[PDB]
């Protein structure tokens, strides 16, 4: 009957979260991960679906989600176990026609709930769709180590942030090239968090969570991990070489004007005039 | 038969002994593990038991485990071979009526015996089971790299370290607001080390053994072992920041006020009056 | 039909890439390997190239390639993925009689190219070859963490970075005893850092890229990945050595002078004169 | 036919070799590896021998290893290759009734030979067997790493070092009470480290090169690799602690003193005394 199970996003559910669980980056429930999905996608699987799908509302209407369906992980689930029982720790949930609420079509068994941080998660969704003109369909938060540690010996400012995460990899600028939008730290769970982080997502693909970690957005799976890994690579370069003395040398202002140029990228600009 | 190797407990404790060889806690013998069973896991198994179960006795009188299964790591055993082979490596143990010793039911082969350890992990699955009403089923010791390096550093006392950790990552509160208790160095394998974990135990999930590890206790081998991992994660963010000499911000007093009134847990007051 | 995924090279290039994608030198994209081949490597599976393969210009005549084979990560492609198709992220490409441009006869399916980083690897086969006598058959880059890191805070100079890395563990002399090249800073994907990486490699089978990653030559792709790890492993001890303080004593002129004569190796000048 | 790399022993080298690459400790072709057999091991797999067993004298004679069989690590092969291809990359040897030579019984097949490092290993083994009166089987040397950073920044001092990593976790004291003994840097592959390492053997059972690696020995493969873990794990605690500024704290003379009269070992008095 096809099974779900080895859908591509489900496979791909299990591939971003076991490897970011390998890189340490997912301790216990602490990361949780979103990926838009069309109709299309699971139109073949109607028969994998629990018979009678669960209904929960959202935290707050949510139209531009509407008839929209997700995979998700789980409220209190750990990145680690996704691979044993993805039923378990994943679920496929499909936004009703106001935006006001969601069924629960496949997985999230034993009354399991999509994660706590879901107003993070799909309020972000409707900033990058407008955005990105719908070409970003993945939200995903992890506690990356380094980029972590950051937060408590850099300045928390965008633009300091997002210089030296370019400095400490040729690519970043390329890969992030708008940015990483750092929040005051807020507490989690709330649509405080979840709104502001939206609002930071206008502008950035990368929001940080001081002394927390970090969400990305992305078209696929794929881009967005290696997004964030990219971010996080820089940071354990940074945090090496903080240890060791701080740079003798770096990439100059440029120079990262010269490697936008070359990629058809536009910096951003106080990052930049630093 | 059902076969007792692919039981739940016997498949648990694999999983937990094995991911905490692969994060580097555990070399050589450096570790123990205790999970608590109540008979209607272990009954479907009977023909698995040896049929001659060994008797040992316990160190000290147990009443409180009176007639209670268990399953245990050996002494002297390695986690990176739980997985090659269960039954040398662990057994399933059953107290007698009077807590005054036990029966080996099932592993433990070659003449093996539970961890040395053993004080350390059924005092505190005494004292665990009164002050939870009997939630907590699991005792963990690992030699966490992060948290070891850090009691050299770190003044050994329950305030400071566990407001340090509270700091270095934001969950970290909400999964241990009790906090972290901390013994000074004392002779690992004797009921002393035993019982003073235990009596810390009754105040805090996690106790740190300086220069040497740390325990933790919990409802489920994963809550256990994420208990852990969590405490060693932000242990590992803050020898980082400390290598990068020491926080520019951190999080305030609150701010932990705020996650513990948001997450409804009663931060432990010593380490929040800091 | 045999099938050329199970070929010996296919299945290098998946061992190299995975191993390291493990290693953390290659997250996203951020790495590219380059084997050359024989006809009599790739003729026994023409049935399974490409019923039509596709051409692609090179960026500059390269007559000493001409009908050569090789097999090549694409561009865009993430190491991490290789194993998983390999026909999706590797392609077999053989040079045209005029060294002009290639035939894409297996791989790099919907319409990848090989890597942006070409002109570095096509260019330093080149000189390897002519350098080695045709011994040389790898090119491999990857953005090597410790690496990376010092060359924010050692001297960018041939000689003072070779003797460093000589230093970090022993056998680094007799693994490149020609030392590492290293260039300025310059902008990624051009002929103008392909052909300066191809002009050190003239001298040195280690080229570093500061603020970015490493390339390496050899005759096997084994030779190649552990002349890599050889350089990283060092780097790796020199980050530790520096976080500590620095060598309070370390190895003297020588000693290399004598590991040298023993091992029958002509350590780079420069670097044995500091 | 059985199949001799089913054999406890040919599997056992996989495991150690594997585990020992997996660490980080043998980039390349650096680490080497010697068990010491009975005839009866290999007896039952006679026909697994090759066929005309290739010849190769001794350094110089050892006739205390007279008629003794071992599985060996070859020359220039790499850990991570061992699971890939056990016959290329271990051999079986029995050494001549003379002691002055060796036939190659098992593996080592396209004309690999034994470890460069064979005096090392084979004198050691006859140092070992004098001072353990026949208990001790294996000679384990690798690169690990943060033992080797050590040596750029302790006193490469027998008493020092011991009593260092003895303080760098609890347990290391029990493990080796005998301390680490350490050579001054000499150049590899010779009869002067190799006996300059027996001599060190006698008194130890882990050898440090400084800028180089580590031996260890013990009775069986699991029991020396975990003594080499034990010793590295300490130094990667003492790594860190150093790189945050030193221990405001540690274990006493003991604290020391007790442990060792509890575990029934007598430390090494140079050691304690400090
Ligand atoms: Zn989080
Ligand atoms: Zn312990
Ligand atoms: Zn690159
Ligand atoms: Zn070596």
Redesign the interface.
Known sequence: MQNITYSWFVQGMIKATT?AWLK?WD????GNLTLRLDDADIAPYHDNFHQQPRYIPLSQPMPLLANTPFIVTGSGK?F??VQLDPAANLGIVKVDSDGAGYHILWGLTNEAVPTSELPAHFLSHCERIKATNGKDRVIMHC?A??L??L????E?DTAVFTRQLW?????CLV?FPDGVGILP?M????DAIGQATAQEMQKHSLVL????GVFGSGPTL?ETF??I??A??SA??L??????????????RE?LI??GK??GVTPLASALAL
């Open positions: 490897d340490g301790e216990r429930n602490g750990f680690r176990n506690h180590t380094n972590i540690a937060t408590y010996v850099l928390n400095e400490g990899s040729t690519e890969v730290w507490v989690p769970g709330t969570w001081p002394f927390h794929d290696g997004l890994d990219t996080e690579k354990q370069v945090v090496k070489v903080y240890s060791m003395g701080g740079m003798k040398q770096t990439i100059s120079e010269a490697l070359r990629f």
